[PDB]
Amino acid sequence: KGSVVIVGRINLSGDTAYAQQTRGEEGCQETSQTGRDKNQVEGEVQIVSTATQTFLATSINGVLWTVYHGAGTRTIASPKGPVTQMYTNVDKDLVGWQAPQGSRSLTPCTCGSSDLYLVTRHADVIPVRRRGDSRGSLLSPRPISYLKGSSGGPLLCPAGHAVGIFRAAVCTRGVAKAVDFIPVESLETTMRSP
Ligand SMILES: COc1ccc2c(O[C@@H]3C[C@@H](C(=O)N[C@@H](CC(F)F)C(=O)NS(=O)(=O)C4CC4)N(C(=O)[C@@H](NC(=O)OC(C)(C)C)C(C)(C)C)C3)cc(-c3ccccc3)nc2c1
Ligand SMILES: [Cl-]
Ligand SMILES: [Zn+2]
């Protein structure tokens, strides 16, 4: 037990992304135990933590999504107390918590662009060439440590719409050359499933 806690956020707003920390380790541990977090949710991407891992969560279609390998079946701390997951799919590595009515959320990409942008937990905005529904190649190889903690973050198109959620890196001898992600169409199938 213990809730996932929002510890920071990434603001995309104007041409350059920036990360903002909102909670330190002590406040995080306290918040995880109660599940009560009075902070209002802002920004396009949330930086979230459990007692052992930090990763990202992204709101799309009014649901805050993240990876199961980070969140497990945990609740998320909120102003109204711990929020139980609305969606849980171990096979897709996907978790979603319903966000409050009218909260800011990304909309799906329908433009078919293959020019994607991955937002990391350090607010780096990396170009990615789409290769299939759930894969994209990096334009520069990166050490795997550069992407650690970015699972749950968004892949965006040039119009700033959501293409998917970052899940895993294609890693060979510590070098990431491509990314594996959960496409927004798959999040929508999860939302439409009873
Ligand atoms: C359907 O496709 C998938 C694909 C991957 C899944 C998964 O991946 C695991 C988790 C993921 C990962 O480690 N994600 C990183 C980002 C990465 F760039 F480093 C992350 O931020 N999360 S974390 O674990 O560090 C935690 C937050 C701090 N993996 C990988 O990135 C691996 N690559 C990989 O698996 O590539 C394939 C898919 C091409 C084979 C390595 C570690 C070698 C780089 C292996 C883990 C799980 C999973 C689900 C539920 C419970 C437990 C595990 N399901 C997956 C389903
Ligand atoms: Cl679009
Ligand atoms: Zn688009």
From TrEMBL:
GO MF, one annotated term: RNA helicase activity
Record-given protein name: NS3
Organism: Hepacivirus hominis
Reaction(s) this enzyme catalyzes, per UniProt: ATP + H2O = ADP + phosphate + H(+)
Alphabetical list of Gene3D superfamilies matching this protein: 2.40.10.120
Localization per record: Host cell; Host membrane; Virion membrane
Domain named Peptidase S29: residues: 16-194
Metal-binding among keywords: no
Keywords: Capsid protein, Glycoprotein, Host membrane, Host-virus interaction, Hydrolase, Membrane, Transmembrane, Transmembrane helix, Viral attachment to host cell, Virion, Virus entry into host cell
